[PDB]
Design a protein around this ligand. Structure first.
Ligand SMILES: Nc1ncnc2c1ncn2[C@@H]1O[C@H](COP(=O)(O)OP(=O)(O)O)[C@@H](O)[C@H]1O
Ligand SMILES: [Mn+2]
Length: 291
């Protein structure tokens, strides 16, 4: 069995001549860069607001998460392309309403839907949040008592989950987790939706720079492998090829959802970096086949 859906989106960062061109005639899921043509499920130009991007890219997942399916939204790309901004990895309180990312918007749609069905349901739903960090291929629980001690054979599930009852709680753990953060640092804030009989996760991954100057994008590449392995039942999925695919092992299963947000720079000087990001995207779309 394979994933329910693997979606790929691209978002252009604010300009400061853009190498990113959105054809005057297109399905709106295409873009051209350096004479090459890329086709994805979404192509957000720099003028698209947080709200629009969330409504189109994540909102749909809230329903799957609620029906019990594991969901992952992963942002990757060159440093400074709006990844952390996009996933809303900064404390909500200090951020203006229009600039709030996916994290706080998703938590709100979750609460609203849980409260709108707390009377008519199969059984009460509990909501928690975990904050993990991968530093130099080593998982760190930023919400635990030892936010500086690697994990092993127990990082997937074992990871302090703090209760969530309001945006205030999300702010707290986002503030806490941040203060516990010390050449690549990826963040994974998982919104856990637990019930007596079901546990579904919404993994919001905010990877570190993909630029250069096992490599640096072992996580990313490892995901593609893992994906292609499920579409053909290789009997042995390479979940351990990287900490990233290990920590997200319970979410990289059949019927689970995965979405990539490729953030790119519109600047000429980042041409090579922007192309790498786009190329990987294409591969992810290719492996995304058969699903
Ligand atoms: N779409 C956007 N709208 C307004 N400001 C943005 C946008 N995207 C990025 N920024 C700003 O650019 C800077 C870098 O964004 P950031 O997400 O931290 O890059 P990254 O996390 O990928 O290294 C931050 O000040 C962020 O607010
Ligand atoms: Mn960042």
């Amino acid at each position: 069995a394979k994933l329910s859906a693997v979606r790929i989106a691209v978002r252009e960062a604010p300009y400061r001549p853009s190498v990113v061109q959105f054809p005057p005639w297109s399905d709106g899921k295409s873009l051209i860069v350096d004479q090459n043509e890329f086709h994805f499920d979404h192509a957000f130009p720099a003028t698209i607001s947080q709200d629009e991007m969330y409504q189109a890219l994540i909102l749909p997942l809230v329903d799957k998460l609620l029906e019990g399916f594991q969901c992952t939204a992963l942002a990757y790309g060159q440093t400074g392309t709006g990844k952390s901004y996009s996933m809303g990895m900064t404390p909500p309180g200090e951020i203006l309403p229009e600039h709030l990312g996916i994290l706080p918007r998703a938590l709100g749609d979750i609460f609203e839907r849980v409260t709108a069905r707390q009377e008519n349901n199969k059984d009460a739903i509990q909501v928690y949040a975990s904050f993990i960090e991968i530093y130099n291929e080593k998982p760190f629980d930023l919400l635990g008592s030892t936010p500086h001690m690697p994990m092993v054979a127990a990082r997937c599930q074992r990871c302090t989950c703090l209760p969530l009852h309001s945006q205030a709680d999300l702010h707290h753990i986002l503030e806490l987790g941040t203060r516990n953060r010390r050449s690549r640092s990826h963040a994974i804030v998982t919104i856990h939706v637990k019930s007596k009989t079901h546990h579904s996760r919404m993994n919001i991954v905010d990877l570190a720079g993909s630029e250069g100057v096992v490599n640096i994008n072992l996580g990313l590449l490892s995901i593609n492998k893992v994906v292609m392995s499920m579409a053909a039942g290789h009997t042995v999925i390479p979940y351990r090829d990287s900490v990233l695919t290990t920590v997200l092992q319970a979410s990289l299963t059949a019927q689970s959802y995965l979405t990539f947000l490729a953030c790119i720079s519109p600047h000429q000087c980042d041409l090579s970096e922007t192309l790498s990001t786009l190329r990987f995207g294409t591969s992810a779309k290719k492996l995304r086949l058969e699903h």
